Write a protein that binds this ligand. Sequence first.
Ligand SMILES: [Li+]
Length: 259
Amino acid sequence: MNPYERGPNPTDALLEARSGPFSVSEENVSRLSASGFGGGTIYYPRENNTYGAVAISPGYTGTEASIAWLGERIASHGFVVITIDTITTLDQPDSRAEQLNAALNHMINRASSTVRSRIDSSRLAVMGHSMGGGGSLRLASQRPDLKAAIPLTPWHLNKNWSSVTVPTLIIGADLDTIAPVATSAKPIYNSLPSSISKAYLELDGATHFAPNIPNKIIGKYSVAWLKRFVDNDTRYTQFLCPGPRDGGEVEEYRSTCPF
Ligand SMILES: [Li+]
C-alpha cells in the first residue's frame, strides 16, 4: 500500500535502542567538495532502497561532532542523513538555513553514485540544534516542499513561523538557559497554525546541550516524526498521537494530533 515503508514494524524498544535496524555506511564530504557549507559526513543505509534524505546542522560554536550520533542513529532507521559543519562556527540562523539547503543539494547532486541512487530526492527533511534549529525553520519557511523539520532547542531572531506549512517537531529543554523555551521554543511552537502537523516535546531535566549526546527520547521521536511525514508511514502515528506520557523522561508534549 504505502511504497515508502522501510524496516520492521516499530516498537518502543526498537526506537529506543542506540541503533536502528538498518546497517549504515558513511560517505565523507570534504570542505573542498562542499559548496556553501563546511563539509560533513553522509550516513546511509546499505540496503538497496530509496529513502528520504535529511540534513542536520549544529548550533553556535558547534561542530558536526555535536550532532554525529543523531545522524547515524536516524540513518540506521531508513534515511540518508548528512551531518554538516557550517562555513564558520559563528554563522547565524539564516546563513545556516542556506547551508542546510546546500547540504540537501550536495547529497542529491554531488555525492557519489552509491549515495545518490539511495535517495528519493522528492522527500527531504531538515533538522537543527539551536541556531541550526532556526536554520531549519527559516529554510522550511522558504521551502514548503520539504516533508519534515525538527528544530532541536531552537533559537531564531524571529519566533513567528506561522507561514511554515512543513510538519514540524519542536524539541525544547526545561533547564535550557541559552535558548529558554519560554522565550524561544514555545513561542516558536505556538506560532505555527493548528492546521498543520506539529508537536512540541520538552525534555525533562535537560539543558540546551542535551541534543549533543545520545538521548533515547530525541532519537525515538525524531525517527517517529521523520517516519510519519518523510515516509508517510502511518505505523508511526501511534507514537506521536496522543504522544509521550509525563510523570517520565518527557516533561511536556503538545501536538496537533490526530495525524
Ligand atoms: Li523538569
